[PDB]
Design a protein around this nucleic acid. Sequence first.
RNA 1: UUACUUAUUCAAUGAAGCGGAGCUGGAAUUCAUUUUCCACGUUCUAGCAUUCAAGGUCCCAUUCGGGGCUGAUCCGGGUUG
Lengths: 96, 59, 135, 91, 56, 116, 251
Amino acid sequence: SINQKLALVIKSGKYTLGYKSTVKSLRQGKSKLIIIAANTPVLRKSELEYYAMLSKTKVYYFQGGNNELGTAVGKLFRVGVVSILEAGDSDILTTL
Amino acid sequence: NPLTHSTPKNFGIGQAVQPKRNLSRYVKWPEYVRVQRQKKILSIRLKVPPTIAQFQYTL
Amino acid sequence: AKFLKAGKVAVVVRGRYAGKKVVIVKPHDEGSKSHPFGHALVAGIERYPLKVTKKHGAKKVAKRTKIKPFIKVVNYNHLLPTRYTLDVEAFKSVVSTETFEQPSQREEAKKVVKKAFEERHQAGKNQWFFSKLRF
Amino acid sequence: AKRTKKVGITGKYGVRYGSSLRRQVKKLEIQQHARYDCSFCGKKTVKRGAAGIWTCSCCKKTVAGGAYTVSTAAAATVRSTIRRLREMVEA
Amino acid sequence: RPRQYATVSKTHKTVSRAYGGSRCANCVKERIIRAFLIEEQKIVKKVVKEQTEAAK
Amino acid sequence: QTLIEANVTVKTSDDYVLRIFAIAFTRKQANQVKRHSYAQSSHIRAIRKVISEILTKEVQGSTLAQLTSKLIPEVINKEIENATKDIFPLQNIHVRKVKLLKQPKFDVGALMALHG
Amino acid sequence: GRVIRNQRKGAGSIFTSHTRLRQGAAKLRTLDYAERHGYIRGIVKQIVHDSGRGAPLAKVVFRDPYKYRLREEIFIANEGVHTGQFIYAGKKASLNVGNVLPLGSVPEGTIVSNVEEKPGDRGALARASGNYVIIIGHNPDENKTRVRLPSGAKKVISSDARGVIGVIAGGGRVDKPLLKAGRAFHKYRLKRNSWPKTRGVAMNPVDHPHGGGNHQHIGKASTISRGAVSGQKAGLIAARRTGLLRGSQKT
RNA sequence: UUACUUAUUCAAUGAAGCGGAGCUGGAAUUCAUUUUCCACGUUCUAGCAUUCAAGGUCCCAUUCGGGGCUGAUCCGGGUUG
């Protein structure tokens, strides 16, 4: 399941949390996957979509709010968007 | 020529402000104008006795 | 996968030039001395040209085709990149970090950028860049 | 800390108005003074201004909702019903 | 007060940014971003409609 | 013996929808000495899913006249038996009532087509 | 022997409504061209409390299709309608909460509110908080729509009549006991001068048909004919039945 | 009870899109091609939309500009229910 893939990525690979960090990563070209929560504001979501289009990285839409995305990413706070720079052990980049 | 471009606005239902068309059909006319037109309409809509239709029979 | 090239087109959204279409010509991604941040040297248009119609004979045309540019060191976070790209050859040499901090050749580079922008606008190209952002 | 056994918020009313009325008022008063999740930002910041006015102060938004709850069961039922009807009409 | 605004010069009643004395920097930035992104969305939707009409 | 009843709501290309039933039973195979021969209640799920899939596939791309003309010769029960032999022979898997839930316009032109 | 309370209410000098703090008449936008030939997109920008009304109101903004300017409308907010939201008004609008589709456009079983009695009267039915109108059926020929009204009533109205889809916000209000003459006083001091009410049996015979007597009793039957005249119509007017009910609404 | 609207009555709107026919396509697939129906440029985002409108076309006694038609179909003046 996607939650298991995210947990494996957390344990093995490298990630950044938050809009500022993920936009920085997209601008610097080191981000590979961008996971955006279902309840992210539409303007922010479209901005991230444009950045990902410009930097040729893959975008996934998490079917769940920022609270659920934080729970899946393993932290006890809200994350509205996460950036996956390397999977480590998961095949999340190759899948979907 | 290279400086100008094709703007055209779309006049759809909720696209852009409608152009200034001819609204002569929907003019709120003065009361006397309304009496004039409606009196003519009533005269031609009612069954006129033959004295009218022997009049309105101009040579 | 970098896309903050030395010739791209973005829109400045913060500062006195907010909502203004600029061309990034010199990207300083790894900081600098006076600006130890991720920034870029860009050359935008302060005053966009007005629309041109067949009904003006060459004089209102020149007046409305006048262009007033600006040059700026601007943060990446305050820049909003766009997919459009502008040619940067006529003013890349004249725009550099040394031309800043000193207003004489700041205005000189502004003159060069103005000449280039007017030429590129009378040329029927880059109409999206030379148009105006409405917000 | 439990200062009162069963009156809860209705300790302000003290002794008057009757136990059953005070209990109904208690249920609706906790409902109206509770803090609710905001479906747009995810923070427990939705307060009630007046009946049907629910303001999220963190994201500066206002929502139309029930007199003493952010969303009523009837509202949820009609939401499901209109969603079902819209989906049927579309497909 | 409004009449003091009348007697006060323009600099103190506005900021050098667009929508200076009417809207804040965050709102101006958000509406600039919205304008640009929605225009891009409209352009790509238009070309998608054109290509699907041409195909069909 | 175990009864299996299934129903589908197949969407028709003629703006109809046909609600279709299907009735099957398990029967005492040869060499059997048991008295009941009940299925494992998951076989029932497998037969239900295969019957639903086959009914949906058959009805899709077919009109009412074609469906009736292929229902009449009683070949669908044999087709089902052929398609599900691997888990059980499964004869007499008949296809019960079908009913249209709604219909398009009065279809006077369709009436001329049928009567011409 | 003297004019009675309802007779004075009709003259209505101190019995008018207290309308200072109300946010304007809550009506739908006019049916000119776009609402009957397409849809117009508006932004509900603000949701406020209308004083004297149990439901919130919505300040919504549309674009004038004929002149460059913005038109502000006062809708009755449906539950779930939030600020800065796209609502859509017209024949070709989508079936979403807050949209202003006509009855002929909405399908069978839809839940609508603030529905028009006739096309173009800008909302007359199911406007109180928590109320709604159900679509029972359609008659395309002589285009009409049978609907159920919150009184549990059947009304057949023109299919071109509009109504905002959803249920009025602020439901469950009457579920809370007022608990206080003070709460009732504030409620009715913002509504109108109709509280407190003295009982006719407590008044004098000059003041009421129920007044007088050495014991507080009505004296005559409290069910009054429909043909009775002003000053006589006190009590139960044209009561078909009377007393505690045992059963259902027969609907 | 019937096919009525002009008296009268009711309700709105800055009396703006009424009735009819045409530009375009999707249909049963046409027992010969308007014969029957429909659509008549907008739904992921609290952005914007206004200078007889830009473009197109013809004519320019040609100054720092214009004129007609178009864009924006035609007919009926019944403002609509």
